[PDB]
Amino acid sequence: NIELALTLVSLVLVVSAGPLVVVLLSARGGNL
Amino acid sequence: FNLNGFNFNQSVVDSQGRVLNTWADIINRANLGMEVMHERNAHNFPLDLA
Amino acid sequence: LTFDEIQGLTYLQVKGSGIANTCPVLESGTTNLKELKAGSYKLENFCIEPTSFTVKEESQFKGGETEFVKTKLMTRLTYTLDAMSGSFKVGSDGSAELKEDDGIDYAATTVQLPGGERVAFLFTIKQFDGKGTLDGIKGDFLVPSYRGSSFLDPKGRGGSTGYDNAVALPARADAEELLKENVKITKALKGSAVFSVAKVDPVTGEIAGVFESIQPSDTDLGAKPPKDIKVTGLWYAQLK
Amino acid sequence: IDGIREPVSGSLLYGNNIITGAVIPTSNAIGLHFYPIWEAASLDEWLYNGGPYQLIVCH
Amino acid sequence: LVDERMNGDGTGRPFGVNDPVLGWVLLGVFGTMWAIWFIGQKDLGDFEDADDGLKL
Amino acid sequence: KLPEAYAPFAPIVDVLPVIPVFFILLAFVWQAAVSFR
Amino acid sequence: MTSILQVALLALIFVSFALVVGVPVVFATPNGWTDNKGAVFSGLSLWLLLVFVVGILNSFV
Amino acid sequence: AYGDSANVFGKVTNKSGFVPYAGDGFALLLPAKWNPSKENDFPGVILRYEDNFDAVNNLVVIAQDTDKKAIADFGSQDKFLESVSYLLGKQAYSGETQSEGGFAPNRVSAASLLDVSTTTDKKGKTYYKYELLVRSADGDEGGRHQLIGATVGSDNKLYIIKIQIGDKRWFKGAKKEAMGAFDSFTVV
Amino acid sequence: LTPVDLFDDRSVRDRGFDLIYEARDLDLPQNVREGFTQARASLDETKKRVKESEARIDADLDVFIQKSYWTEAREQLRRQVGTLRFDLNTLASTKEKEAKKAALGLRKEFIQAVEDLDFALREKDQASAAKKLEITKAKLDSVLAAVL
Amino acid sequence: MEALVYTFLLVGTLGIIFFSIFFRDPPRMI
Amino acid sequence: GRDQETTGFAWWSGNARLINLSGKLLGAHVAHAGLIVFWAGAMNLFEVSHFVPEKPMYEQGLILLPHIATLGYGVGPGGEIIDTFPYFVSGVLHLISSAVLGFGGVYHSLIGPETLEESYPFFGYVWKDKNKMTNILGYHLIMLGLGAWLLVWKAMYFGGVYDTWAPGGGDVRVITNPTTNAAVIFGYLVKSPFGGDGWICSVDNMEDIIGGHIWIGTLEILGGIWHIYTTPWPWARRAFVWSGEAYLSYSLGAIGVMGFIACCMSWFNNTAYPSEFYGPTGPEASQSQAFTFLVRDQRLGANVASAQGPTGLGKYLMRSPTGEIIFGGETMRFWDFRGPWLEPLRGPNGLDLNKLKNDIQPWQERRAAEYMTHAPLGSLNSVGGVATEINAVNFVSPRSWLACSHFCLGFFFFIGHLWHAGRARAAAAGFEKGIDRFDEPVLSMRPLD
Amino acid sequence: AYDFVSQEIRAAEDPEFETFYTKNILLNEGIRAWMAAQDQPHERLVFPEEVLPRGNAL
Ligand SMILES: CCCCCCCCCCCCCCCCCC(=O)OC[C@H](CO[C@@H]1O[C@H](CO[C@H]2O[C@H](CO)[C@H](O)[C@H](O)[C@H]2O)[C@H](O)[C@H](O)[C@H]1O)OC(=O)CCCCCCCCCCCCCCCCC
Ligand code: CLA
Ligand code: CLA
Ligand code: CLA
Ligand code: CLA
Ligand SMILES: CCCCCCCCCCCCCCCC(=O)OC[C@H](CO[C@@H]1O[C@H](CS(=O)(=O)O)[C@@H](O)[C@H](O)[C@H]1O)OC(=O)CCCCCCCCCCCCCCC
Ligand SMILES: CC1=C(/C=C/C(C)=C/C=C/C(C)=C/C=C/C=C(C)/C=C/C=C(C)/C=C/C2=C(C)CCCC2(C)C)C(C)(C)CCC1
Ligand SMILES: CC1=C(/C=C/C(C)=C/C=C/C(C)=C/C=C/C=C(C)/C=C/C=C(C)/C=C/C2=C(C)CCCC2(C)C)C(C)(C)CCC1
Ligand SMILES: CC1=C(/C=C/C(C)=C/C=C/C(C)=C/C=C/C=C(C)/C=C/C=C(C)/C=C/C2=C(C)CCCC2(C)C)C(C)(C)CCC1
Ligand code: OEX
């Protein structure tokens, strides 16, 4: 079921995209 | 506003589509005993919408 | 207010005013009572508004006479009989025949005695058939049982549905109290009413007058003796 | 209470005790309508239709 | 009809007035007590300059 | 459904309403990253 | 035309994913907004260009 | 304790909402959420399922032995239902009343026939199918829908199905369970 | 103990009985449930009610205006007329595309005549409502000479 | 009769409430 | 960022650190206003994607699409949905604008100045400056005033809005004559909130709604100009607390009432919340049942006027406590219900049973039977009956979600009023950190209080 | 503490005496008869639907 699988891929790319900001900003720089 | 409590009545169903009772179905038997007897002369119509 | 004055109001203007509980007064038209053309008429917008509820109460005292006493009303504005269909016949000399078939021809009404006793009744004229001259259209209607057969008392018993006994007293479940548990009597009684046509407006076919009825009150499904209630007031119809 | 013209007793002087006595809610025929003393004809009509409840609950 | 009503149960009158004396009750009692507050306003402080409230 | 020039993008749309629940959770991750100072 | 709209909208998702991650990273790095100013301006002016492309291409469907 | 694997990620076996039944001489598709009742309302009951939720929703088959070979031998469909009028119950209240509304005097219940038919199957035997709405003075369930169907089998035996559904449940989806059971009734 | 009694009501479903049962099963589409599919599928049933709607307008609505029965003229224009907007789209969606704009253009101004008659009947202006009605019947005949 | 007993128990409970407020043992400081 | 010992606020009250930080507080609001527009974009497109045309709008769990349908975008006569693309444009224009609001909200929260007082003196503000606070209050009333004229222009000029009371059935109606009479417009406001009045939840036609938004549009443009050119008068200096948490608490008590109003608005009103889109009201579905069994039993040969109930009041038609012929049953409580399917059957003296024995229209019994099976009772897992009902349908009315969410949000924001108005009045007084322990004011009072 | 006997004697000798107590006694009769065919399966009691207590139209 590709319509259900893309909804899961769209979930993981976005649910990471918040902590991806927090992880990357912690490593390089650090003004959070 | 009639949002109501969880209604898990006839939720557990085996194969061949038959209803397995739960404790929620026993609460429903106690629930629908009260509602066929509360305000016992008010209701002219089958749905207690009020 | 007349009929055309009521119908010239919207629903929100007449709502909550008590105007909706009233019969249309017949302001135009004369009391000559003969120029009404003889023949048959079907009787629509036939409505009856009472003015007094008096009830033949036995005296509080020992040697007191039993008369009709003034009462105050417990139900609010739910007592007018309104929009009844039927047939109206008048003779060549003045003999008139009033008859209603369908419509709102009953009104449950609680009225309270001076003394604190609440007597309830349904004010009805249902299935009326009355004959006589235009000062009296003497006839009888039926008063049904005030509660239906499927009415249930506080102990859960009744006529059509119910236990038929006192279930909370399991040793004296059926006993000397069979008057109020074993049969719930829903037999309909009869009442008599006297109509008197007072004004005729023949150009619009509208007639009005004064009525006088006496009917039984309520038997509590056959548990108390029903009392007699004399209802007077006005009435109105449209001969078309 | 139920608007069906059967009255429900809740008073100590009408055969009730502390457990079963209650000030009965307003009539179902009234509904959410505002029913003070001055909107009744008599004071007994106010007492019949559950008038005291709406005066307690509003205050 | 049978009894006497005030007949204002669902009529939607402004502040629930239907006799005009009820509106003068509203303005009389408000106006009497506005005037007592106004005459007594000389004991409450003259908060006349701009930074003169309970502020933070 | 969506207009049919956009219905292949309907898998992304089913994820879009829950995103402001993740915005309140991101405030807790950011405060955990500074150790709740 | 439909297929160039879906490519332009997929491109809008990747550019928006570049901004949802990148723009808070460029902002809260120390002296990162002065160094990476012209990248974000090229990112925003591409993102804003891609919105008005897809809206005009929706008129042709 | 025989080891069969659990149905992880597996296809369902019954989404039809009907269970096929085979009694003695008949076959029908019962409503799948209904369960057997241990009640014999009538003389001749073989099976009687009722709903799990309320016991008003139920069906019953009745096999009376008869001397006649065809259902037309019982007379017409109008003269048939007055013979088998015991299916609708009996008014156990022989009290006098004129205050119930929408009924004749002294009647606290009034059945109303709404539909008849004369449908058949692949064997050739015609059926007498009925559809009633039986209202009561208290008016429980908003009335009760009756689905009566009757035929005589190949062994001179009168098979009568009667599906009773309360009207409150009728518009809320028990028409699909009842009509699907009522059309599935075939006497072999 | 007495049996229950039957009544010959096998023709009430032929007239009007099984109509609220079609509007309560949630397996049908709502265009089937609201009566919208049945109006679009049978053209003559709309052509029956539209000729019936002008019988309620051309003859039955002026009578309440000279006797000034406002709440019986506000709702004369909504009771059986209360399908006329949906009906005049179905009768106009059977035409040519340059005939449909002629149909829906005339249908649009008859809407503006009824909604102006309603407002005339709302402030109880008898001199305006008796005038707005004659405009309304003229715009009514222009639509019905176009879609049928 | 019992309603007389009921009101005496309700008046008596409201009496103790009146004495517990306006005749309470006053909390002495220090 | 910022920490505790430089502020005195922990991590769990750290938005209180940016009270006196004007620029950071601006980015806090613009990023939050991004979220309201983002939710309104995302939940719109979620409801467009999950819209099924062969089902009602209220059956599908749609709460945002009935708002755009009430404006009349993409609806036909009788509430039929013509096209869904007007609902799609509303979803994208919010979802794209949320990135713009999200950008400047993230900008002023991270890169923009902390306090915009010394560099940008037009936008700078101190909370105790009573002129600048009314100046910002006046700017936003003009925005609310011009926003209220958008509804008037869309109803009068830009296609019209959906009138469910329209002659010929409900469709989109240009409101050519909005009611500008002050006795009618300000008559709702002084009306009682109880039964038969419903304060402002009984506004029964769209001409009062659009004509009332003319009044709320002009008064907010005039009241905005009033606060730009004035400062609060000395009696208002005397009554208010002039801190930023006070101004929040003033807004929290105002908006917590508005949550209670829109709770009872969506539950009772069916003009601004049309039943074709939101489903029947509580009163509407209960009155629809009594109307359904009145038409069911006239056809089965019964005089519904003369039909006496088991209590003796009347099974189908009884009399209202003010004398109107109404429906009988437990739905006597909802006798003051008005509906566009029911009002064609209603004369002056309540319902007209001559009109109701002969002139029941087939579309009225279509619609009232729909409303009976879509009563606003359900369950929390969206079952859809009384609590004694099996898992058959999948339904909770939008009115049941809109009222229940906005009573809870209206209740908590009244609690947020009581929190912040107590705190800001106490923090301006100085004792919000505690008793001073040197001059405890109870110790300077006379005992036996 | 099931019954107040002085209010059961009165409510059986007076068919119009209703309190919230006698309403509670009727609701308990509803709970008892409608659950015990399924709450107590060891009793193996079958109740025909016409013997369970029932108000009007529910
Ligand atoms: C069906 C109908 C129902 C009824 C209608 C219902 C709706 C009514 C809503 C109307 C709007 C109400 C809003 C009122 C705001 C009041 C705010 C306030 O606190 O207002 C505060 C201000 C304070 O004003 C300032 O007050 C100051 C106080 O000074 C005093 O103190 C000073 C130092 O502080 C100096 O010492 C000075 O000398 C001394 O006089 C100064 O005097 C200033 O000059 C003065 O401008 O008041 C003012 O501006 C004026 C206030 C407004 C006018 C109030 C009129 C009240 C009614 C009058 C009619 C009564 C009828 C009686 C009938 C009798 C028969 C029965
Ligand atoms: C609507 C919610 C909301 C908003 C707008 C803010 C906003 C803010 N908070 Mg608050 N906060 C919130 C909820 C919120 N907070 C909650 C729920 C808590 C409790 C957990 C806190 C607890 C808290 C504390 C304890 C503090 C703040 C502070 C701040 C400010 C500085 C932010 C900072 O330096 O972070 C830096 C962090 C990052 C850069 C991490 C990355 C996060 C980015 C912004 C996410 C953006 C994602 C988005 C998709 C980007 C889109 C871009 C666009 C182009 C499309 C800022 C204005 C601080 C303050 O007062 O400053 C003086 C402070 O000390 N907050
Ligand atoms: C406040 C306005 C509001 C309203 C009236 C609705 C109403 C509705 N929504 Mg929408 N929704 C909202 C806000 C709202 N939602 C928000 C903020 C979001 C973003 C998350 C969504 C996202 C959303 C989606 C994605 C979907 C809906 C759906 C629905 C429908 C069914 C919802 C349901 O089953 O809830 C079930 C009931 C609950 C979840 C109870 C909520 C109680 C909350 C969680 C508080 C619990 C208290 C707890 C202790 C506090 C937690 C914090 C603590 C641990 C510290 C209904 C029409 C569905 C639908 O019909 O789509 C067509 C659907 O698929 N909504
Ligand atoms: C967002 C809206 C908003 C806000 C927050 C303010 C805030 C303020 N205004 Mg402004 N104003 C606004 C909109 C707003 N205004 C608009 C739209 C107008 C044009 C109509 C005005 C016209 C205006 C004037 C002319 C004045 C203010 C004043 C004030 C100040 C004190 C107000 C006060 O204490 O009232 C307290 C209110 C009362 C004491 C009235 C009694 C209220 C009770 C509940 C009865 C209300 C009856 C009423 C008819 C409403 C009935 C319905 C109701 C129950 C819902 C304060 C700074 C005063 C000031 O200092 O400005 C310089 C002032 O003189 N305002
Ligand atoms: C628009 C409204 C608004 C605004 C701007 C503020 C702003 C502020 N509040 Mg106030 N507050 C509000 C509404 C508001 N509040 C309401 C409605 C309540 C009642 C619930 C409170 C109760 C409250 C308390 C008790 C406190 C504040 C505090 C504060 C300050 C910092 C808050 C912070 O960093 O949060 C940080 C955020 C968190 C720690 C996360 C909390 C999340 C909770 C668990 C809810 C989760 C959401 C969930 C889905 C909702 C479920 C309920 C639903 C069923 C309706 C700041 C000045 C604090 C302060 O310093 O006082 C000045 C403080 O102690 N507020
Ligand atoms: C009518 C209400 C409803 C009826 C309720 C019926 C039940 C009541 C139950 C409660 C009874 C009282 C409990 C104990 C009170 C106590 O100890 O107070 C202690 C205080 C002592 O305070 C000190 O008393 C001092 C005086 S002295 O010391 O007592 O002489 C004084 O100087 C000093 O200032 C003061 O601090 O007593 C007094 O102040 C006054 C003396 C109180 C006398 C007892 C009253 C008994 C009730 C009679 C009421 C009428 C009943 C018949 C009609 C219904
Ligand atoms: C529109 C769109 C978009 C955008 C999106 C967005 C905007 C997103 C965001 C997102 C986000 C923003 C996310 C976030 C997330 C977060 C999270 C997911 C978190 C979680 C957490 C957890 C889970 C934990 C927590 C904790 C801590 C840490 C502390 C406290 C305690 C606890 C444990 C609770 C894109 C571009 C894609 C494109 C498409 C469309
Ligand atoms: C400060 C801060 C914060 C906050 C933040 C925020 C709140 C933000 C916001 C943000 C936002 C508010 C964002 C937004 C964004 C958006 C976007 C980015 C969008 C985009 C869009 C798109 C992408 C679209 C698309 C489409 C179309 C066009 C159509 C079809 C469909 C689709 C979907 C595909 C926190 C709390 C974390 C913490 C502290 C810090
Ligand atoms: C749109 C619309 C409309 C209109 C509306 C309007 C026009 C409104 C206005 C309104 C208003 C006009 C409102 C007002 C309000 C006010 C208030 C609510 C007040 C409050 C007050 C306060 C809050 C105060 C407090 C206090 C005191 C007590 C004294 C002084 C100081 C203090 C602060 C302490 C109508 C309905 C027709 C229809 C629908 C739509
Ligand atoms: O109000 Mn006391 O409980 Ca609410 O459901 Mn209908 O209404 Mn009456 O019944 Mn069930």
Ligand SMILES: [Cl-]
């Ligand atoms: Cl009860």
Ligand SMILES: [Cl-]
């Ligand atoms: Cl009912």
